[PDB]
Amino acid sequence: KTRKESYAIYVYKVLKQVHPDTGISSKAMSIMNSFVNDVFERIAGEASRLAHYNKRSTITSREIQTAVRLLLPGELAKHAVSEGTKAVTKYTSA
Amino acid sequence: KETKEVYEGEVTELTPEDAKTISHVIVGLKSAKGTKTLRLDPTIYESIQREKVSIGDV
Amino acid sequence: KTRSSRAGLQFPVGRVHRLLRKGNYAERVGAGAPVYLAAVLEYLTAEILELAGNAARDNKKTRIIPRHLQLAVRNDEELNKLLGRVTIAQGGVLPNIQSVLLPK
Amino acid sequence: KAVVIDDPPLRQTPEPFDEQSAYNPQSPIAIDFGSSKLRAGFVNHATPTHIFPNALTKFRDRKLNKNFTFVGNDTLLDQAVRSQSRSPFDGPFVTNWNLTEEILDYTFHHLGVVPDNGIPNPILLTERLATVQSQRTNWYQILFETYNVPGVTFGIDSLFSFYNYNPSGNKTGLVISCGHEDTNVIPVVDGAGILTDAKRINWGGHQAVDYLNDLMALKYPYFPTKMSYLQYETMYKDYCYVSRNYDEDIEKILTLENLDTNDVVVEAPFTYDWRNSILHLFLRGPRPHDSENIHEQHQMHLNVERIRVPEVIFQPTMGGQDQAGICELSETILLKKFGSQPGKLSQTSIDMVNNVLITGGNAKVPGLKERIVKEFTGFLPTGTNITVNMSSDPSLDAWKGMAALARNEEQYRKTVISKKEYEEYGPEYIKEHKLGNTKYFE
Amino acid sequence: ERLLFLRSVGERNEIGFPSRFKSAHYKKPTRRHKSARQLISDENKRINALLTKANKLVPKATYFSVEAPPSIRPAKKYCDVTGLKGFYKSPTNNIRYHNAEIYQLIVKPMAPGVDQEYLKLRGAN
Structure with a gap:
């Protein structure tokens, strides 16, 4: 059959990791699949325009860093830039 | 009428030599006024191994 | 490998x-x-x-219905501004009745 | 009562020049290309005659439409001409070369020299340790083409001061130089500097005053008046000392019994109890803080940094340099090298202990000699006679070094390079002598 | 008088292109600025070229050989706020601190981006 692309198992077992005794339904998997590619194209576009506004021809951590510091209203960005910097330091550590 | 001779300080070098039977061990002790090297008999080396003495232990 | x-992360890279x-x-x-x-x-x-999750244990249900994420997303102003313009299928209306509209 | 610092005052008179009738073409010229100051003069004189920082300005005048050039002490005449001073040293090396030519022209004009077809005097030059081939190549180019000098010789300033304080030229010792931008340890055997065991730590006076600058920027982020580099230099010079034991001094310097005596309050120039909170002790000392007083928020408080910034030399991990300390590097040199078993000092090590010399521009900080004597007594075996020699002014012993070297004509000819040797061997040539750099390979 | 004294200093130290000090023949070429950042890499490439030509010879005293080995003893931890003895390191932003109240009113409410030149002093960024 067709090889459909969906991150439903990823959200399913971070749900299982943080909530070990909680269930879920297939409409929920479709609904935050719509969430995560909605924000994926939204912030992929944002950085794109921005970098092009900056006249840079690439996408490193800097453009997306200012995009996620600028885009969403608050709080989640304050934890998000810290946890993303911590993620790229465990990447460069490895 | 007895005497008391005491060496105390931080271990900086614990180098034993054999010939499975250890012959002796050169032990270096360091305090705030300098350092002093010591040769030791293997029985005191066995007692040192009993006390779990490594490099840097006073 | x-x-x-x-990267130590769970979402795929x-x-x-x-x-x-x-x-x-x-x-x-x-x-x-x-x-x-x-x-x-x-x-x-x-x-x-x-x-x-806290909406699910507030309603005491093991399965998160999308209505649970409606009153989870309408309980914070950051996602009320991030997802205010969005339209959700089978979302309902949060409980909100004006004091003047109530009788007496 | 808080003290107020300023810029150093400008010189009322300009720098005089020597008489041209006293010049002779047989006397050599001694120069010391230091990172902070320039020392120029003859050899027969022992006292200095020209000391000035290496800087130059291009003052464009509106009425005459002519770019005037002010060099060194001539830059210390007006505040605007002091602020536009430009050093030729970029990093630990030199990068712009024409500035070196015009400051050398200024020194030659102010030495009272009337030459013809270039300078007829051989020159005596200090150079940094492990100096890069490009700057010595350009040095050979400028002296052998621009100035037509007959001879040249080179060496390290630390070894030159060591030879100054050991004029026999055959002694064994351990020299330590704390320069403006680097700190060097050279073990010297039989009057010859063993440079394969030399060690360098990337810290000096410039990094220390930059540490003061960004430490004061970080401690008081809401300070309104930007204070210049000279204020940082002066309050590093006047209010800093080496602690005798940094582990024990740091656990009691925040108590109220020390902050009444060991806190310096520096006033900027312009036209729920606080006792139990160490923030108020760290920021505003043992006196209560009033935010409405106009003179109050123009104040530094130097309580921890006075013993913190000289400890970067002893522990470079504070300054971000992943290097061993001065005491640990000296332990490595003295206890496990030159045939010295750890725990059994060789005679080379014993001779190196009795001739420990501290020199350089950054030895002016008090408490350094006592601290290094305490560390040396700490790690050496008991009974070793430790001798530390410190000059009254260790910023001038290099000029005494080339003065004693060129006065000693017997060993002066072993290090000189003429025009003929350079012309036959090119710029790529290494003169292997005792008091200078060695070959890059074996 | 104030604006005329610097003219006297300039005309006293006035020198020109055909000065009496530099030599008669010049042959002065152009010169690139050649900042000190690329100089260490230039020497590294040069010494690598020399060792690779020798490989197709042990160095004695270079810039990269005199330079100090790192410390074998562990470095003492210190609080980055006060320069005191550091006991605790905050897990959210990785700054060592000495006691509770600097964690309360300095380490917690600090602005983002202050961390990078906070840790620039010890080079932990």
């Missing part, structure tokens, strides 16, 4: 890199940008999965 495990290559955003892509995307994505779904 996977790069997501090397090769999948978003694949979607970034042929997604026609930039002709050159850095290494840390898909990791940063996966990090902010993991943070966003971690936050609303905590919200859906």
Whole structure:
């Protein structure tokens, strides 16, 4: 059959990791699949325009860093830039 | 009428030599006024191994 | 040996890199940008999965209905501004009745 | 009562020049190309005659439409011409070369020299340790083409001061130089500097005053008046000392019994109890803080940094340099090298202990000699006679070094390079002598 | 008088292109600025070229050989706020601190981006 692309198992077992005794339904998997590619194209576009506004021809951590510091209203960005910097330091550590 | 001779300080070098039977061990002790090297008999080396003495232990 | 495990993250980093290559955003892509995307994505779904979890134990249900994420997303102003313009299928209306509209 | 610092005052008179009738073409010229100051003069004189920082300005006048050039002490005449001073040293090396030519022209004009077809005097030059081939190549180019000098010789300033304080040229000792931008340890055997065991730590006076600058920027982020580099230099010079034991001094310097005596309050120039909170002790000392007083928020408080910034030399991990300390590097040199078993000092090590010399520009900080004597007594075996020699002014012993070297004509000819040797061997040539750099390979 | 004294200093130290000090023949070429950042890499490439030509010879005293080995003893931890003895390191932003109240009113409410030149002093960024 067709090889459909969906991150439903990823959200399913971070749900299982943080909530070990909680269930879920297939409409929920479709609904935050719509969430995560909605924000994926939204912030992929944002950085794109921005970098092009900056006249840079690439996408490193800097453009997306200012995009996620600028885009969403608050709080989640304050934890998000810290946890993303911590993620790229465990990447460069490895 | 007895005497008391005491060496105390931080271990900086614990180098034993054999010939499975250890012959002796050169032990270096360091305090705030300098350092002093010591040769030791293997029985005191066995007692040192009993006390779990490594490099840097006073 | 996977790069997501090397980054210590759970959301995949090769999948978003694949979607970034042929997604026609930039002709050159850095290494840390898909990791940063996966990090902010993991943070966003971690936050609303905590919200859906406390809504689920507020209603005392083992399965998160989308209505649970409606009153999870309408209980904070940050996602009331981030997802205020959005329209949700089978979302309902949060309980909100004006004091003047109530009798007596 | 708080003290107020300023810029150093400008010189009322300009720098005089020597008489041209006293010049002779047989006397050599001694120069010391230091990172902070320039020392120029003859050899027969022992006292200095020209000391000035290496700087130059291009003052464009509106009425005459002519770019005037002010060099060194001539830059210390007006505040605007002091602020536009430009050093030729970029990093630990030199990069712009024409500035070196015009400051050398200024020194030659102010030395009272009337030459013809270039300077007829051989020159005596100090150079940094492990100096890069490009700057010595350009040095050979400028002296052998621009100035037509007959001879040249080179060496390290630390070894030159060591030879100054050991004029026999055959002694064994351990020299330590704390320069403006680097700190060097050279073990010297039989009057010859063993440079394969030399060690360098990337810290000096410039990094220390930059540490003061960004430490004061970080401690008081809401300070309104930007204070200049000279204020940082002066309050580093006047209010800093080496602690005798940094582990024990740091656990009691925040108590109220020390902050009444060991806190310096520096006033900027312009036209729920606080006793139990160490923030108020760290920021505003043992006196209560009033935010409405105009003179109050123009104040530094130097309580921890006075013993913190000289400890970067002893522990470079504070300054971000992943290097061993001065005491640990000296332990490595003295206890495990030159045939010295750890725990059994060789005679080379014993001779190196009795001739420990501290020199350089950054030895002016008090408490350094007592601290290094305490560390040396700490790690050496008991009974070793430790001798540390410190000059009254260790910023001038290099000029005494080339003065004693060129006065000693017997060993002066072993280090000189003429025009003929350079012309037959090119710029790529290494003169292997005792008091200078060695070959890059074996 | 104030604006005329610097003219006297300039005309006293006035020198020109055909000065009496530099030599008669010049042959002065152009010169690139050649900042000190690329100089260490230039010497590294040069010494690598020399060792690779020798490989197709042990160095004695270079810039990269005199330079100090790192410390064998562990470095003492210190609080980045006060320069005191550091006991605790915050897990959110990785700054060592000495006691509770600097964690309360300095380490917690600090602005983002202050961390990078906070840790620049010890080079932990």
